[PDB]
Amino acid sequence: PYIVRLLNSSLNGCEFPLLTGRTLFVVGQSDALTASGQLPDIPADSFFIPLDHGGVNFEIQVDTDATEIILHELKEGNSESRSVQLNTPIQVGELLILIRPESEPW
Amino acid sequence: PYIVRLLNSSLNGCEFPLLTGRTLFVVGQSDALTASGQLPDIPADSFFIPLDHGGVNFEIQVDTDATEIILHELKEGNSESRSVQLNTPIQVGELLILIRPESEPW
Amino acid sequence: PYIVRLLNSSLNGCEFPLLTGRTLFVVGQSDALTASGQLPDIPADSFFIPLDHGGVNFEIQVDTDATEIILHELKEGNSESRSVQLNTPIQVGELLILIRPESEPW
Amino acid sequence: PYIVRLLNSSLNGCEFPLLTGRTLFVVGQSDALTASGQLPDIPADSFFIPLDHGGVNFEIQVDTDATEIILHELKEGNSESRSVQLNTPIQVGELLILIRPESEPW
């Protein structure tokens, strides 16, 4: 299984497990934060990351084979996708994240 | 495992264990101090160091192999990295620190 | 292990054990005295010495090999170091101290 | 072990044991007397001797070998030392003292 580690922001060092399938990361201010509590905490498929500006919401898709990891950067009325690699800084908006195997600490 | 020892500041002689991965050191005044209590004390990945001026926040990254230690000096909108050596004074801003093996007292 | 003995001041004859590593001596008036109580009394790495004038803060560094003893005299924005010898008067500011082995009374 | 015996003053005949190392004798008026009670009575390394004028503070240093006895006469910003002999009147300021072995009464 894979883990998203924040490399910057006020939550630098936070690590969020990923579930097979798609996981949403809402990145922004308190308006999004307080509005994100409307969905249950069942096997988390979404997370909120505070970021004072330049935040961009994104989704990380992990296939059932776990041989490819796609990151969907969400934009107005659309999304853009890219393939990402493990153990390397990934910049989404002003947020810097790293996706690692659970067994390979960063 | 490695330990950060402060060589100056009002906490001179304080020693902070490092965990595999990244550890944040917030260095500054009371605004940062009282605002740093918003995150839990779970296996500490962050520390606050008081310093009346010239403080610079930084991160110490310890690889899982423990064969290289990187120090990321945080700057506005960016960070600068450098490799550091054990048992030698390291200057970050006006702060002077030393990174040592747990078994090698300074 | 080594012991610092004061040879002058109002605490003349006081003896302070040294721990492997660095020990801070704050030397000055009551402003420093009452402000020095903000850190815990865990294995003391700091001490306060009253001195009506000419006091200078310093650190005594004892290596893990105990084959060299360095005294860091603290100055504004910097420190100066010197190697010191056992069983001899050492002048730091107006303070006169002596560093002796625990087994060799002065 | 050695003993200091006062040969004059209002405490004439008082005998004060000496400990290996340095012992302080504060000699003066009531200002010094009432200010001398700020240190604990642990293995005494200091004593107060009343003397209406000409009092001079001094220290008696007894080496661990007990083969030499040094008397440090304290002066402003400095001290002067001299070697003293057992069983003979020693004048410090207007105070007259005698240092004797514990087994040799005066």
Coordinates of all heavy atoms in Angstrom, one line a residue, chain A residues 13-99:
Chain A
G13 N 5.1 16.7 7.1 CA 5.4 15.4 7.7 C 4.2 14.5 8.0 O 4.3 13.3 8.2
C14 N 3.0 15.1 7.7 CA 1.8 14.2 7.9 C 1.8 13.2 6.8 O 2.1 13.5 5.6 CB 0.5 15.0 7.9 SG 0.1 15.9 9.4
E15 N 1.3 12.0 7.2 CA 1.3 10.9 6.3 C -0.1 10.3 6.2 O -0.6 9.7 7.2 CB 2.3 9.8 6.7 CG 3.7 10.3 6.4 CD 4.8 9.2 6.6 OE1 4.4 8.1 7.0 OE2 5.8 9.3 5.9
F16 N -0.7 10.2 5.0 CA -2.0 9.7 4.8 C -2.1 8.5 4.0 O -1.4 8.4 2.9 CB -2.8 10.8 4.0 CG -2.9 12.1 4.7 CD1 -2.0 13.1 4.4 CD2 -3.9 12.4 5.7 CE1 -2.0 14.4 5.1 CE2 -3.9 13.6 6.3 CZ -3.0 14.6 6.0
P17 N -2.6 7.4 4.5 CA -2.7 6.2 3.8 C -3.5 6.3 2.6 O -4.6 7.0 2.6 CB -3.3 5.2 4.8 CG -4.1 6.0 5.7 CD -3.3 7.3 5.8
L18 N -3.2 5.5 1.5 CA -4.1 5.5 0.3 C -4.8 4.2 0.2 O -4.2 3.1 0.3 CB -3.2 5.8 -0.9 CG -2.5 7.1 -1.0 CD1 -1.6 7.1 -2.2 CD2 -3.6 8.2 -1.1
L19 N -6.0 4.3 -0.2 CA -6.8 3.1 -0.5 C -6.8 2.8 -1.9 O -6.4 3.6 -2.7 CB -8.2 3.2 0.1 CG -8.3 3.5 1.6 CD1 -9.8 3.6 1.9 CD2 -7.6 2.5 2.4
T20 N -6.9 1.5 -2.3 CA -7.0 1.1 -3.7 C -8.2 1.9 -4.2 O -9.3 2.0 -3.6 CB -7.3 -0.4 -3.9 OG1 -6.2 -1.1 -3.3 CG2 -7.3 -0.7 -5.3
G21 N -8.0 2.5 -5.4 CA -9.0 3.4 -5.9 C -8.6 4.8 -5.8 O -7.4 5.2 -5.9
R22 N -9.6 5.7 -5.7 CA -9.3 7.1 -5.8 C -9.4 7.8 -4.4 O -10.3 7.5 -3.6 CB -10.2 7.8 -6.8 CG -9.9 9.3 -7.1 CD -10.7 9.9 -8.1 NE -10.4 9.4 -9.5 CZ -11.1 9.6 -10.6 NH1 -12.2 10.3 -10.5 NH2 -10.7 9.1 -11.7
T23 N -8.4 8.7 -4.1 CA -8.5 9.4 -2.8 C -8.4 10.9 -3.2 O -7.6 11.4 -3.9 CB -7.3 9.1 -2.0 OG1 -7.3 7.7 -1.6 CG2 -7.3 9.9 -0.7
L24 N -9.3 11.7 -2.6 CA -9.4 13.2 -2.8 C -8.7 13.9 -1.7 O -8.8 13.7 -0.5 CB -10.9 13.6 -2.8 CG -11.1 15.1 -2.9 CD1 -10.6 15.6 -4.2 CD2 -12.6 15.4 -2.7
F25 N -7.9 14.9 -2.2 CA -7.3 15.8 -1.2 C -7.7 17.3 -1.5 O -7.6 17.7 -2.7 CB -5.7 15.8 -1.4 CG -5.2 14.5 -0.9 CD1 -5.1 13.4 -1.8 CD2 -4.7 14.3 0.4 CE1 -4.6 12.2 -1.4 CE2 -4.2 13.1 0.8 CZ -4.2 12.0 -0.1
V26 N -8.5 17.8 -0.6 CA -9.0 19.2 -0.7 C -7.9 20.0 0.0 O -7.7 19.9 1.2 CB -10.3 19.3 0.1 CG1 -10.7 20.8 0.0 CG2 -11.4 18.4 -0.6
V27 N -7.4 21.0 -0.8 CA -6.3 21.8 -0.3 C -6.7 23.3 -0.3 O -6.9 23.9 -1.4 CB -5.1 21.6 -1.2 CG1 -3.9 22.4 -0.6 CG2 -4.7 20.1 -1.2
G28 N -6.8 23.9 0.9 CA -7.3 25.3 0.9 C -7.6 25.8 2.3 O -6.7 25.6 3.2
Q29 N -8.4 26.9 2.3 CA -8.7 27.6 3.6 C -9.8 27.0 4.4 O -10.4 25.9 4.1 CB -8.9 29.1 3.3 CG -7.7 29.8 2.8 CD -7.6 29.9 1.3 OE1 -8.0 28.9 0.6 NE2 -6.9 30.9 0.8
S30 N -10.1 27.7 5.5 CA -11.1 27.2 6.5 C -12.5 27.0 5.9 O -13.3 26.2 6.4 CB -11.1 28.2 7.6 OG -11.6 29.4 7.2
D31 N -12.8 27.7 4.8 CA -14.1 27.5 4.2 C -14.3 26.1 3.8 O -15.3 25.4 4.2 CB -14.4 28.4 3.0 CG -13.3 28.4 1.9 OD1 -12.3 27.9 2.2 OD2 -13.7 28.3 0.8
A32 N -13.3 25.5 3.2 CA -13.3 24.1 2.7 C -13.2 23.2 3.9 O -14.0 22.3 4.1 CB -12.1 23.9 1.8
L33 N -12.4 23.6 4.9 CA -12.2 22.8 6.1 C -13.5 22.5 6.9 O -13.9 21.4 7.1 CB -11.3 23.5 7.1 CG -10.9 22.7 8.3 CD1 -11.8 23.0 9.5 CD2 -11.0 21.2 8.0
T34 N -14.3 23.6 7.1 CA -15.5 23.4 7.9 C -16.6 22.8 7.1 O -17.3 21.9 7.5 CB -15.9 24.7 8.6 OG1 -16.0 25.7 7.5 CG2 -14.8 25.2 9.6
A35 N -16.5 23.0 5.8 CA -17.4 22.3 4.9 C -17.1 20.9 4.5 O -17.9 20.2 4.1 CB -17.6 23.2 3.6
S36 N -15.9 20.4 4.9 CA -15.5 19.1 4.6 C -16.0 18.0 5.6 O -16.3 16.9 5.2 CB -14.0 18.9 4.5 OG -13.5 19.6 3.4
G37 N -16.6 18.5 6.7 CA -17.1 17.6 7.7 C -18.5 17.1 7.5 O -19.0 16.4 8.4
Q38 N -19.0 17.2 6.3 CA -20.3 16.8 6.0 C -20.4 15.3 5.5 O -21.5 14.8 5.3 CB -20.9 17.7 4.9 CG -21.1 19.1 5.4 CD -21.6 20.0 4.3 OE1 -22.8 19.9 3.9 NE2 -20.7 20.8 3.7
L39 N -19.2 14.7 5.3 CA -19.2 13.3 4.9 C -18.5 12.5 6.0 O -17.8 13.0 6.8 CB -18.4 13.2 3.6 CG -18.9 13.9 2.4 CD1 -18.0 13.8 1.2 CD2 -20.3 13.4 2.1
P40 N -19.0 11.2 6.1 CA -18.6 10.3 7.2 C -17.1 9.9 7.1 O -16.5 9.8 6.0 CB -19.5 9.1 7.1 CG -19.8 9.1 5.6 CD -20.0 10.5 5.2
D41 N -16.5 9.5 8.2 CA -15.1 9.1 8.3 C -14.9 7.6 8.0 O -14.0 7.0 8.6 CB -14.6 9.4 9.7 CG -14.6 10.9 10.1 OD1 -14.2 11.7 9.2 OD2 -14.9 11.2 11.2
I42 N -15.9 7.0 7.3 CA -15.7 5.6 6.9 C -14.4 5.6 6.0 O -13.9 6.7 5.7 CB -16.9 5.2 6.0 CG1 -17.1 6.1 4.8 CG2 -18.2 5.2 6.9 CD1 -18.1 5.7 3.8
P43 N -13.8 4.4 5.9 CA -12.5 4.2 5.2 C -12.2 5.4 4.3 O -12.5 5.4 3.1 CB -12.8 3.0 4.4 CG -13.5 2.1 5.4 CD -14.2 3.0 6.3
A44 N -11.4 6.3 4.9 CA -11.2 7.6 4.3 C -10.8 7.6 2.9 O -9.6 7.3 2.6 CB -10.2 8.4 5.1
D45 N -11.5 8.3 2.1 CA -11.2 8.5 0.7 C -11.1 10.0 0.4 O -11.1 10.4 -0.7 CB -12.4 7.9 -0.2 CG -13.7 8.6 0.0 OD1 -13.8 9.5 0.8 OD2 -14.6 8.3 -0.7
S46 N -11.1 10.8 1.5 CA -10.8 12.2 1.3 C -10.1 12.8 2.5 O -10.5 12.5 3.7 CB -12.1 13.0 1.1 OG -13.0 13.0 2.2
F47 N -9.3 13.8 2.3 CA -8.6 14.5 3.3 C -8.5 16.0 3.1 O -8.4 16.4 1.9 CB -7.1 13.9 3.4 CG -7.1 12.5 3.7 CD1 -6.9 11.5 2.7 CD2 -7.3 12.0 5.0 CE1 -6.8 10.2 3.0 CE2 -7.2 10.7 5.3 CZ -7.0 9.8 4.3
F48 N -8.4 16.8 4.1 CA -8.3 18.2 4.0 C -6.9 18.7 4.4 O -6.4 18.4 5.5 CB -9.3 19.0 4.9 CG -9.0 20.5 4.8 CD1 -9.4 21.2 3.7 CD2 -8.3 21.1 5.8 CE1 -9.1 22.6 3.7 CE2 -8.0 22.4 5.8 CZ -8.5 23.2 4.7
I49 N -6.2 19.5 3.6 CA -4.9 20.0 3.8 C -5.0 21.5 3.8 O -5.5 22.1 2.9 CB -3.9 19.6 2.8 CG1 -3.8 18.0 2.8 CG2 -2.6 20.2 3.0 CD1 -3.0 17.5 1.7
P50 N -4.6 22.2 4.9 CA -4.7 23.6 5.0 C -3.5 24.2 4.2 O -2.4 23.8 4.4 CB -4.6 23.9 6.4 CG -3.7 22.8 7.0 CD -4.1 21.6 6.1
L51 N -3.8 25.2 3.4 CA -2.7 25.9 2.7 C -3.2 27.3 2.4 O -4.3 27.5 1.7 CB -2.4 25.1 1.4 CG -1.2 25.7 0.6 CD1 0.1 25.5 1.4 CD2 -1.0 25.0 -0.7
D52 N -2.4 28.3 2.8 CA -2.9 29.7 2.8 C -3.1 30.3 1.4 O -4.1 31.0 1.2 CB -1.9 30.6 3.6 CG -0.5 30.4 3.1 OD1 -0.3 29.7 2.2 OD2 0.4 30.9 3.7
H53 N -2.4 29.8 0.4 CA -2.7 30.2 -1.0 C -2.1 29.2 -2.0 O -1.1 28.6 -1.7 CB -2.2 31.6 -1.3 CG -0.7 31.6 -1.8 ND1 0.3 31.3 -0.9 CD2 -0.2 31.7 -3.0 CE1 1.4 31.4 -1.6 NE2 1.1 31.6 -2.9
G54 N -2.6 29.2 -3.2 CA -2.1 28.4 -4.3 C -2.5 26.9 -4.1 O -1.8 26.0 -4.6
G55 N -3.4 26.6 -3.2 CA -3.9 25.3 -3.0 C -4.7 24.8 -4.2 O -5.6 25.5 -4.7
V56 N -4.5 23.6 -4.6 CA -5.2 22.9 -5.7 C -5.7 21.6 -5.3 O -4.9 20.8 -4.8 CB -4.4 22.8 -7.0 CG1 -5.2 22.1 -8.1 CG2 -3.9 24.2 -7.4
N57 N -7.0 21.3 -5.4 CA -7.5 20.0 -5.1 C -7.0 18.9 -6.0 O -6.8 19.2 -7.2 CB -9.1 20.0 -5.0 CG -9.6 21.0 -4.0 OD1 -8.9 21.5 -3.2 ND2 -10.9 21.0 -3.9
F58 N -6.8 17.7 -5.5 CA -6.3 16.7 -6.4 C -6.7 15.3 -6.0 O -7.1 15.1 -4.8 CB -4.8 16.7 -6.6 CG -4.0 16.5 -5.3 CD1 -3.6 15.2 -5.0 CD2 -3.8 17.5 -4.4 CE1 -2.8 15.0 -3.9 CE2 -3.0 17.3 -3.3 CZ -2.6 16.0 -3.0
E59 N -6.7 14.4 -6.9 CA -7.0 13.0 -6.6 C -5.9 12.1 -6.9 O -5.2 12.3 -7.9 CB -8.2 12.6 -7.4 CG -9.5 13.4 -7.1 CD -10.6 13.0 -7.9 OE1 -10.5 13.0 -9.1 OE2 -11.7 13.0 -7.4
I60 N -5.6 11.1 -6.1 CA -4.6 10.1 -6.4 C -5.2 8.8 -6.6 O -6.2 8.4 -5.8 CB -3.5 10.0 -5.3 CG1 -2.8 11.3 -5.1 CG2 -2.5 8.9 -5.5 CD1 -1.8 11.4 -4.0
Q61 N -5.1 8.3 -7.8 CA -5.7 7.0 -8.2 C -4.6 5.9 -8.2 O -3.6 6.0 -8.9 CB -6.3 7.1 -9.6 CG -6.9 5.8 -10.1 CD -7.5 6.0 -11.5 OE1 -7.6 7.1 -12.0 NE2 -8.0 4.9 -12.0
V62 N -4.9 4.9 -7.4 CA -4.1 3.7 -7.3 C -4.8 2.5 -7.9 O -5.8 2.1 -7.3 CB -3.7 3.5 -5.8 CG1 -2.8 2.2 -5.7 CG2 -2.9 4.7 -5.2
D63 N -4.3 2.0 -9.0 CA -4.9 0.8 -9.6 C -4.8 -0.4 -8.7 O -3.9 -0.5 -7.9 CB -4.2 0.5 -11.0 CG -4.6 1.5 -12.0 OD1 -5.5 2.3 -11.8 OD2 -4.2 1.3 -13.2
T64 N -5.7 -1.4 -9.0 CA -5.7 -2.6 -8.2 C -4.5 -3.4 -8.4 O -4.1 -4.1 -7.5 CB -6.9 -3.5 -8.7 OG1 -8.2 -2.8 -8.4 CG2 -6.9 -4.8 -7.9
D65 N -3.7 -3.2 -9.5 CA -2.4 -3.8 -9.7 C -1.3 -3.1 -8.9 O -0.3 -3.7 -8.6 CB -2.1 -3.9 -11.2 CG -3.1 -4.7 -12.0 OD1 -3.4 -5.8 -11.6 OD2 -3.4 -4.3 -13.1
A66 N -1.5 -1.9 -8.6 CA -0.5 -1.0 -7.9 C 0.7 -0.9 -8.7 O 1.8 -0.6 -8.1 CB -0.2 -1.6 -6.5
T67 N 0.6 -0.9 -10.0 CA 1.8 -0.7 -10.9 C 1.8 0.6 -11.5 O 2.7 0.9 -12.3 CB 1.7 -1.8 -12.0 OG1 0.5 -1.7 -12.8 CG2 1.8 -3.2 -11.4
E68 N 0.8 1.4 -11.3 CA 0.7 2.8 -11.8 C 0.0 3.7 -10.9 O -1.2 3.4 -10.5 CB 0.1 2.8 -13.2 CG 0.1 4.2 -13.8 CD -0.4 4.2 -15.3 OE1 -1.5 3.7 -15.5 OE2 0.3 4.8 -16.1
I69 N 0.5 4.9 -10.6 CA -0.1 5.9 -9.8 C -0.4 7.1 -10.6 O 0.5 7.7 -11.2 CB 0.7 6.2 -8.5 CG1 0.9 4.9 -7.7 CG2 0.0 7.2 -7.7 CD1 1.9 5.1 -6.6
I70 N -1.6 7.5 -10.7 CA -2.1 8.7 -11.4 C -2.5 9.8 -10.5 O -3.4 9.6 -9.7 CB -3.2 8.3 -12.4 CG1 -2.8 7.2 -13.4 CG2 -3.6 9.5 -13.2 CD1 -1.6 7.6 -14.2
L71 N -2.1 11.0 -10.8 CA -2.5 12.1 -10.0 C -3.4 13.0 -10.9 O -3.0 13.3 -12.1 CB -1.4 12.9 -9.4 CG -1.7 13.9 -8.4 CD1 -0.6 14.0 -7.4 CD2 -1.9 15.3 -9.1
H72 N -4.6 13.2 -10.5 CA -5.5 14.1 -11.2 C -5.6 15.5 -10.5 O -6.1 15.5 -9.4 CB -6.9 13.5 -11.2 CG -7.0 12.1 -11.7 ND1 -6.9 11.8 -13.1 CD2 -7.2 10.9 -11.1 CE1 -7.0 10.5 -13.2 NE2 -7.2 10.0 -12.0
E73 N -5.1 16.5 -11.2 CA -5.1 17.8 -10.7 C -6.5 18.5 -11.1 O -6.8 18.5 -12.3 CB -4.0 18.6 -11.2 CG -3.8 20.0 -10.7 CD -2.4 20.6 -11.2 OE1 -1.4 19.9 -10.9 OE2 -2.5 21.4 -12.0
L74 N -7.3 18.9 -10.1 CA -8.6 19.4 -10.5 C -8.6 20.8 -10.8 O -8.4 21.7 -9.9 CB -9.5 19.1 -9.3 CG -9.6 17.6 -8.9 CD1 -10.6 17.5 -7.7 CD2 -10.0 16.7 -10.0
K75 N -9.3 21.1 -11.9 CA -9.4 22.5 -12.4 C -10.8 22.8 -12.7 O -11.7 22.0 -12.4 CB -8.5 22.6 -13.7 CG -7.0 22.4 -13.4 CD -6.2 22.7 -14.7 CE -4.7 22.6 -14.4 NZ -3.9 23.2 -15.5
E76 N -11.1 24.0 -13.0 CA -12.6 24.4 -13.2 C -13.2 23.7 -14.4 O -12.6 23.7 -15.5 CB -12.8 25.9 -13.3 CG -14.2 26.3 -13.4 CD -14.5 27.7 -13.2 OE1 -14.0 28.6 -13.9 OE2 -15.2 28.1 -12.2
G77 N -14.2 22.8 -14.1 CA -14.9 22.1 -15.1 C -14.1 21.0 -15.8 O -14.7 20.2 -16.5
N78 N -12.9 20.7 -15.2 CA -12.1 19.7 -15.8 C -11.0 19.3 -14.9 O -11.0 19.5 -13.7 CB -11.5 20.2 -17.1 CG -10.9 19.1 -18.0 OD1 -11.3 18.0 -17.9 ND2 -9.8 19.5 -18.6
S79 N -10.2 18.2 -15.3 CA -9.1 17.8 -14.5 C -8.0 17.4 -15.5 O -8.2 17.3 -16.6 CB -9.5 16.6 -13.6 OG -9.8 15.5 -14.4
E80 N -6.7 17.5 -15.0 CA -5.6 17.1 -15.8 C -4.9 16.0 -15.1 O -4.5 16.1 -13.9 CB -4.7 18.3 -16.0 CG -5.2 19.3 -17.0 CD -4.2 20.4 -17.3 OE1 -3.1 20.3 -16.7 OE2 -4.6 21.5 -17.7
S81 N -4.5 15.0 -15.8 CA -3.9 13.8 -15.2 C -2.4 13.7 -15.6 O -1.9 14.3 -16.6 CB -4.6 12.6 -15.6 OG -4.4 12.3 -17.0
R82 N -1.7 13.1 -14.6 CA -0.3 12.8 -14.9 C 0.1 11.6 -14.1 O -0.3 11.4 -13.0 CB 0.6 14.0 -14.5 CG 0.4 14.5 -13.1 CD 1.2 15.8 -12.9 NE 0.9 16.4 -11.6 CZ 1.6 17.4 -11.0 NH1 2.7 17.2 -10.4 NH2 1.0 18.5 -10.7
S83 N 1.1 10.8 -14.6 CA 1.6 9.7 -13.9 C 2.7 10.2 -13.0 O 3.4 11.1 -13.3 CB 2.1 8.7 -14.9 OG 2.7 7.6 -14.2
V84 N 2.7 9.6 -11.8 CA 3.7 10.1 -10.8 C 4.6 8.9 -10.3 O 4.1 7.8 -10.1 CB 3.1 10.8 -9.6 CG1 2.3 12.0 -10.1 CG2 2.1 9.8 -9.0
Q85 N 5.8 9.2 -9.9 CA 6.7 8.2 -9.4 C 6.9 8.3 -7.9 O 6.5 9.2 -7.3 CB 8.0 8.4 -10.1 CG 7.9 8.3 -11.6 CD 7.4 7.0 -12.2 OE1 7.8 5.9 -11.7 NE2 6.5 7.1 -13.2
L86 N 7.1 7.1 -7.4 CA 7.4 6.9 -6.0 C 8.7 7.5 -5.5 O 9.6 7.8 -6.3 CB 7.4 5.4 -5.6 CG 6.0 4.7 -5.8 CD1 6.3 3.2 -5.6 CD2 5.0 5.2 -4.8
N87 N 8.6 8.0 -4.3 CA 9.8 8.5 -3.6 C 10.4 9.7 -4.2 O 11.6 10.0 -4.0 CB 10.8 7.4 -3.4 CG 10.4 6.3 -2.6 OD1 9.5 6.5 -1.7 ND2 10.5 5.1 -3.1
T88 N 9.6 10.6 -4.8 CA 10.1 11.8 -5.3 C 9.1 13.0 -5.1 O 7.9 12.8 -5.2 CB 10.3 11.7 -6.9 OG1 10.9 12.9 -7.4 CG2 9.0 11.3 -7.6
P89 N 9.6 14.2 -4.8 CA 8.7 15.3 -4.6 C 7.8 15.6 -5.8 O 8.3 16.0 -6.9 CB 9.7 16.5 -4.4 CG 10.9 15.8 -3.9 CD 11.0 14.5 -4.6
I90 N 6.6 15.7 -5.5 CA 5.5 16.0 -6.5 C 4.9 17.3 -6.1 O 4.4 17.5 -5.0 CB 4.4 14.9 -6.4 CG1 5.0 13.6 -6.8 CG2 3.3 15.3 -7.4 CD1 4.0 12.4 -6.5
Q91 N 4.9 18.3 -7.1 CA 4.3 19.6 -6.8 C 2.9 19.7 -7.4 O 2.6 19.3 -8.5 CB 5.2 20.7 -7.3 CG 4.6 22.1 -7.0 CD 5.6 23.2 -7.4 OE1 6.7 22.9 -7.9 NE2 5.1 24.4 -7.3
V92 N 1.9 19.9 -6.5 CA 0.5 20.1 -6.9 C 0.1 21.5 -6.4 O -0.1 21.7 -5.2 CB -0.4 19.1 -6.2 CG1 -1.8 19.3 -6.7 CG2 0.0 17.7 -6.6
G93 N 0.0 22.5 -7.3 CA -0.2 23.8 -6.8 C 1.0 24.2 -6.1 O 2.2 24.1 -6.6
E94 N 0.9 24.9 -4.9 CA 2.0 25.2 -4.1 C 2.3 24.1 -3.1 O 3.1 24.3 -2.1 CB 1.8 26.5 -3.3 CG 1.6 27.7 -4.2 CD 2.8 28.0 -5.1 OE1 3.9 28.0 -4.6 OE2 2.6 28.0 -6.3
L95 N 1.5 23.1 -3.1 CA 1.7 21.9 -2.2 C 2.8 21.0 -2.7 O 2.9 20.8 -3.9 CB 0.4 21.2 -1.9 CG 0.4 20.1 -0.9 CD1 0.6 20.7 0.5 CD2 -0.9 19.3 -0.9
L96 N 3.6 20.5 -1.8 CA 4.7 19.5 -2.2 C 4.4 18.2 -1.4 O 4.3 18.2 -0.2 CB 6.0 20.1 -1.9 CG 7.2 19.2 -2.3 CD1 7.3 19.1 -3.8 CD2 8.5 19.7 -1.7
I97 N 4.2 17.1 -2.2 CA 3.9 15.9 -1.6 C 4.8 14.8 -2.1 O 5.7 15.1 -2.9 CB 2.5 15.4 -1.9 CG1 2.3 15.2 -3.4 CG2 1.5 16.5 -1.5 CD1 1.0 14.5 -3.8
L98 N 4.9 13.7 -1.4 CA 5.6 12.5 -1.8 C 4.8 11.3 -1.6 O 4.1 11.1 -0.7 CB 6.9 12.5 -1.0 CG 7.9 11.4 -1.4 CD1 9.3 12.0 -1.5 CD2 7.9 10.3 -0.3
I99 N 4.8 10.4 -2.6 CA 4.1 9.1 -2.5 C 5.1 8.0 -2.3 O 6.0 7.9 -3.1 CB 3.2 8.9 -3.7 CG1 2.1 10.0 -3.8 CG2 2.4 7.6 -3.5 CD1 1.4 9.9 -5.1

